[PDB]
Design a protein around this nucleic acid. Structure first.
Ligand SMILES: [Mg+2]
Length: 679
DNA sequence: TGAGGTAGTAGGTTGTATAGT
RNA sequence: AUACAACCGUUCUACCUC
């Protein structure tokens, strides 16, 4: 069950490395005072930057593509307050073999630096690292938007340059605060220094004179900024009151002549289309690749191809087959039970709208389960009595409450949610200027409601390598030492979530991961009276792989087969068809155990971002894994009309982590973990 | 709070380090 | 909190989609 086709990656093959590049100059470093021994590594890279060439770190020394005589071989550094004196010593050259991953790594660091350094020298071109911006996409009243691309340059195993390209844009507010003010434009959100990158939350304009404000040092504002050479060639203008990097109420003094506004997208909207149709993006990518090759003498670009296989579209089962979850409202649910729902009105109206009661009764008739609708005659304004009302509805079997309400402020939303959650009542909010013809909104609402209640509504009828697929999210951190969360989808049925639930400090990451996993295991055991034969482990690849060692070990001790797979929402590059149209379910195998996956592609103008996956453990054939993950993409019961770009367990753990973020909510004790309260 | 995506940007986190010796 | 380094980037705004 597949297909076959060919695609271009947004990578390009360029010229072979010439003999000199294959034989970099080697340099021995001498510092004073030496020190470090274990800290003698960031220092090495820093020296490699101070030298001022195409030079990188290589072993205990330096590799360079720049002749040592055009380097700053002797100079000084200031690292964390300490001042070092360095001298570089040319020690001849040493050949590097691309076939050695270490040496090729060095070669690629050199290639990257080559790209950046050579791009800096181009006239009529703006460069901010691995980003180059040529043309001018749009300009108006003091600000312009430049169009270019983000790049990378590394070295193949066959010893040739490889150039990744992807068009981006840049919003430059090429002016000054003072002026910007004049144009009559409104004071922006945050403001930025004109002499560095530190940015302060713009609080208010001042009322006093810069030559008066006494600073902690004896200096005034104006001559403080004058002393450090900043008023040299510019008019300081009026005084401003910026707010600190983090957050505070204690403001700081600044100058509208040393401040530059920073425009977000919305600021431009108050005057866009920075998305590109995939055809246009491919074109511009090619153009910029040939342009770079031309200007840098790297030859004419050969776009790299790759075989791609069109995966089979999954079989979504409600009562019968469905194209999308929303249809199950007409057709019926996969596994319905005796369910009790509750209404909570905050618009001071009475009961269920008729079309909602109808839609629900219909959907449940088509499922033969018997539905029971309650109404909460209670309000949060009551105090404890409200909590009591909630408790009563719970004991009467209510599983979830729909909340008809005008647009709630963030804080009130979270407070209300958390409130119902204390009494074990998941809730779906429906904003109440509500017409019946708004089918999408209230049907999605209804789906969320039912999901929260514990219904299944849809399933994948297929057969898959692992009957348990659990996804791991680590919040916004690079480890589970500070907690994270898991969501489990059982082949394509049953849904569970788990929190770290064991403090957030002196926690061993491996043990956290194993705890999440073990709890999902035990949930599965409770629902099935057995342990699963194989589990699919999905992580977001932002935490070290070592953090799953204990979980894998434990899965083995228990005779449970596994497959560890890493999923990265960003970095997969772009993917274009050679001929024809680009479609869903694209599987694009790549290097050692890694592949691309173009899961989603609907009526959006912009180019799709393929997923990048790495089979890090287990002996399941890649195509099989890609199959299962792609199908897991279609098992999100809350979206109803559109599929998420990520597999259900990861998408779920994302919404979960974000919701715990929004609410409390350490011990969500009364909430059943079969109930997806966070969608 | 209806939800899916591509767009930039702020915005954020985590790691090492400061001095001491 | 300072510096440096690495990575991610929901909110928001917009366009749209069903
Ligand atoms: Mg929801």
């Amino acid at each position: 069950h597949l297909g076959k086709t060919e695609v271009f990656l947004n990578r390009f093959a360029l010229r072979p490395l010439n003999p000199e590049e294959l034989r970099p100059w080697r340099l021995e470093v001498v510092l004073d005072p030496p020190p470090g021994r274990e800290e003698v590594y960031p220092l090495l890279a820093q020296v490699a930057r101070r030298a001022g060439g195409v030079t990188v770190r290589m072993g205990d020394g330096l590799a360079s593509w720049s002749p040592p005589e055009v380097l700053v071989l002797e100079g000084t550094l200031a690292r964390m307050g300490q001042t070092y004196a360095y001298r570089l010593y040319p020690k001849g050259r040493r050949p590097l073999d691309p076939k050695d991953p270490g040496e090729r790594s060095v070669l690629s660091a050199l290639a990257r630096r080559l790209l950046q350094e050579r791009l800096r020298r181009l006239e009529g071109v703006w460069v901010e690292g691995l980003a180059v911006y040529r043309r001018e996409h749009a300009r108006g009243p003091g600000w312009r938007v430049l169009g270019g691309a983000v790049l990378d340059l590394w070295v193949s195993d066959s010893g040739a340059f490889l150039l990744e390209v992807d068009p981006a844009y840049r919003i430059l507010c090429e002016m000054s605060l003072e002026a910007w003010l004049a144009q009559g434009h409104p004071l922006p959100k945050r403001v930025r220094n004109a002499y560095d990158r530190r940015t302060w939350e713009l609080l208010r304009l001042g009322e006093e004179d810069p030559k008066e404000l006494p600073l902690p040092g004896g200096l005034s504002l104006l001559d403080y900024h004058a002393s450090k050479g900043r008023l040299q060639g510019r008019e300081g203008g009026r005084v401003a009151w910026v707010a600190d990097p983090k957050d505070p109420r204690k403001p700081i003094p600044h100058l509208t002549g040393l401040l530059v506004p920073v425009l977000t997208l919305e600021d431009l909207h108050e005057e866009l289309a920075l998305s590109l149709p995939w055809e246009e993006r491919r074109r511009r990518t090619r153009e910029i690749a040939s342009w770079i090759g031309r200007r840098l003498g790297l030859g004419t670009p050969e776009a790299v191809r790759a075989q791609a296989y069109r995966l089979s579209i999954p079989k979504l089962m409600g009562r019968r087959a469905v194209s999308k979850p929303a249809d199950a409202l007409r057709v019926g649910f996969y596994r319905a039970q005796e369910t009790a729902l509750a209404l909570l009105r905050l618009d001071g109206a009475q009961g269920w709208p008729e079309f909602l009661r109808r839609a629900l009764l219909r959907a449940f008739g088509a499922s033969g389960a018997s539905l029971r609708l309650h109404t909460l005659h209670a309000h949060p304004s009551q105090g404890l009595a409200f909590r009591e009302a909630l408790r009563k509805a719970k004991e009467e079997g209510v599983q979830a409450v729909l909340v008809l309400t005008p647009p709630m402020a963030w804080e009130d939303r979270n407070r209300l949610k958390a409130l119902l959650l204390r009494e074990g009542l998941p809730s779906q909010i429906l904003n109440v200027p509500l017409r019946e013809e708004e089918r999408h909104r209230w049907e999605n609402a209804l789906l969320g409601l039912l999901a929260k209640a514990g219904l299944q509504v849809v399933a994948l009828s297929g057969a898959y390598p692992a009957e348990l697929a659990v996804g791991f999210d680590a919040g916004g951190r690079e480890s589970f030492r500070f907690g994270g969360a898991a969501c489990a989808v059982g082949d394509g049925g049953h849904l569970l979530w788990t929190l770290p639930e064991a403090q957030a400090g002196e926690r061993i990451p491996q043990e956290v991961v194993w705890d999440l996993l073990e709890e999902t295991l035990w949930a599965f055991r409770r629902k099935a009276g057995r342990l699963p034969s194989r589990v699919l482990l999905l992580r977001n690849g932002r935490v070290p792989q070592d953090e799953f060692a204990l979980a894998l070990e434990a899965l083995a001790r228990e005779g449970i087969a596994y497959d560890l797979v890493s999923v990265r929402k960003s970095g997969g590059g772009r993917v274009y068809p050679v001929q024809g149209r680009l479609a869903d379910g694209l599987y694009v195998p790549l290097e050692d155990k890694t592949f691309l996956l173009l899961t989603v592609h609907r009526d959006f103008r912009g180019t799709p971002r393929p997923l990048k996956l790495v089979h890090e453990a287990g002996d399941t054939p890649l195509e099989a894994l890609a199959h299962q993950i792609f199908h897991l993409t279609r098992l999100y019961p809350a979206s109803g009309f559109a599929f998420p770009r990520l597999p259900a367990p990861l998408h779920l753990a994302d919404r979960l982590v974000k919701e715990v973020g929004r609410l409390g909510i350490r011990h969500l004790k009364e909430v059943d973990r079969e109930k997806l309260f966070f969608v």
